[PDB]
Design an enzyme around this catalytic site. Structure first.
Site, PDB file in Angstrom:
ATOM      1  N   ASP A 111      62.796 108.008  74.233  1.00  0.00           N
ATOM      2  CA  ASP A 111      62.606 109.183  75.125  1.00  0.00           C
ATOM      3  C   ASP A 111      63.779 110.140  74.856  1.00  0.00           C
ATOM      4  O   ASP A 111      64.910 109.656  74.759  1.00  0.00           O
ATOM      5  CB  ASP A 111      62.662 108.798  76.600  1.00  0.00           C
ATOM      6  CG  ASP A 111      61.380 108.162  77.135  1.00  0.00           C
ATOM      7  OD1 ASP A 111      60.345 108.052  76.368  1.00  0.00           O
ATOM      8  OD2 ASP A 111      61.369 107.815  78.350  1.00  0.00           O
ATOM      9  N   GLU A 123      65.237 112.081  85.350  1.00  0.00           N
ATOM     10  CA  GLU A 123      64.948 111.651  83.955  1.00  0.00           C
ATOM     11  C   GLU A 123      66.242 111.681  83.127  1.00  0.00           C
ATOM     12  O   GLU A 123      66.522 110.713  82.384  1.00  0.00           O
ATOM     13  CB  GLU A 123      63.859 112.486  83.275  1.00  0.00           C
ATOM     14  CG  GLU A 123      62.490 112.297  83.880  1.00  0.00           C
ATOM     15  CD  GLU A 123      61.802 110.995  83.463  1.00  0.00           C
ATOM     16  OE1 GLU A 123      62.417 110.237  82.682  1.00  0.00           O
ATOM     17  OE2 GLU A 123      60.746 110.679  84.049  1.00  0.00           O
ATOM     18  N   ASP A 152      58.442  99.364  73.266  1.00  0.00           N
ATOM     19  CA  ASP A 152      57.468  99.432  72.149  1.00  0.00           C
ATOM     20  C   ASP A 152      58.154  99.986  70.887  1.00  0.00           C
ATOM     21  O   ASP A 152      57.434 100.150  69.872  1.00  0.00           O
ATOM     22  CB  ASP A 152      56.251 100.229  72.599  1.00  0.00           C
ATOM     23  CG  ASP A 152      56.449 101.719  72.716  1.00  0.00           C
ATOM     24  OD1 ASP A 152      57.643 102.162  72.778  1.00  0.00           O
ATOM     25  OD2 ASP A 152      55.415 102.402  72.816  1.00  0.00           O
ATOM     26  N   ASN A 211      58.636 111.272  74.939  1.00  0.00           N
ATOM     27  CA  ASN A 211      58.576 109.997  74.192  1.00  0.00           C
ATOM     28  C   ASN A 211      57.980 110.196  72.785  1.00  0.00           C
ATOM     29  O   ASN A 211      57.034 110.961  72.626  1.00  0.00           O
ATOM     30  CB  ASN A 211      57.767 109.032  75.034  1.00  0.00           C
ATOM     31  CG  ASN A 211      56.699 108.344  74.256  1.00  0.00           C
ATOM     32  OD1 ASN A 211      55.675 108.944  73.928  1.00  0.00           O
ATOM     33  ND2 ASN A 211      57.004 107.110  73.919  1.00  0.00           N
ATOM     34  N   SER A 217      59.521 103.017  70.598  1.00  0.00           N
ATOM     35  CA  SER A 217      59.637 104.488  70.787  1.00  0.00           C
ATOM     36  C   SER A 217      60.957 104.801  71.521  1.00  0.00           C
ATOM     37  O   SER A 217      61.558 103.868  72.068  1.00  0.00           O
ATOM     38  CB  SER A 217      58.448 105.029  71.555  1.00  0.00           C
ATOM     39  OG  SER A 217      58.469 104.589  72.896  1.00  0.00           O
ATOM     40  N   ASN A 263      62.655 102.676  74.260  1.00  0.00           N
ATOM     41  CA  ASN A 263      61.549 102.012  75.010  1.00  0.00           C
ATOM     42  C   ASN A 263      61.207 100.652  74.378  1.00  0.00           C
ATOM     43  O   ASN A 263      61.499 100.425  73.179  1.00  0.00           O
ATOM     44  CB  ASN A 263      60.295 102.887  74.998  1.00  0.00           C
ATOM     45  CG  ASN A 263      60.544 104.271  75.569  1.00  0.00           C
ATOM     46  OD1 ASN A 263      60.034 105.262  75.055  1.00  0.00           O
ATOM     47  ND2 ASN A 263      61.382 104.346  76.589  1.00  0.00           N
TER      48      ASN A 263
END
Length: 129
Positions: A52, A35, A48, A59, A50, A46
């Protein structure tokens, strides 16, 4: 902060992730490797809108507030910037809530694709734990 593999394994164990919701420590170290490459300051946008955040890429669509993810939730009740600290407490506390959400560690795409169905015990090899 960029943790050493055994360094992170020790911290995660201390904060009680070893066997949390049935996931062995190796699963958590493997997820953090793929990750974030063990970097607490990792961020990734991301599609959308958002982002992380941190060593387990939590998120802003669900788990934390970054002020720029409209109509999102903050289920860990924390600013996303808390997830980038050299102190992993906020990331572990939020990860315990994510992994309890009923999808297990499938909430972590890098876990699913690079860890699940592998021998994650390899990730704690050589550590004094």
């Amino acid at each position: 902060k960029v943790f050493g593999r055994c360094e992170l394994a020790a911290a995660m164990k201390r904060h009680g992730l070893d066997n949390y919701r049935g996931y062995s420590l190796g699963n958590w170290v493997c997820a953090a490797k793929f990750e974030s490459n063990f970097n607490t300051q990792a961020t990734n946008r991301n599609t959308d809108g958002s982002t992380d955040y941190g060593i387990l890429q939590i998120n802003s669509r669900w788990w934390c507030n970054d002020g720029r993810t409209p109509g999102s939730r903050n289920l860990c009740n924390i600013p996303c910037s808390a997830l980038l600290s050299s102190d992993i407490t906020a990331s572990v506390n939020c990860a315990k809530k994510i992994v309890s959400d009923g999808n297990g560690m499938n909430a972590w795409v890098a876990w699913r694709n690079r860890c699940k169905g592998t021998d994650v015990q390899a990730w704690i090899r050589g550590c004094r734990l």
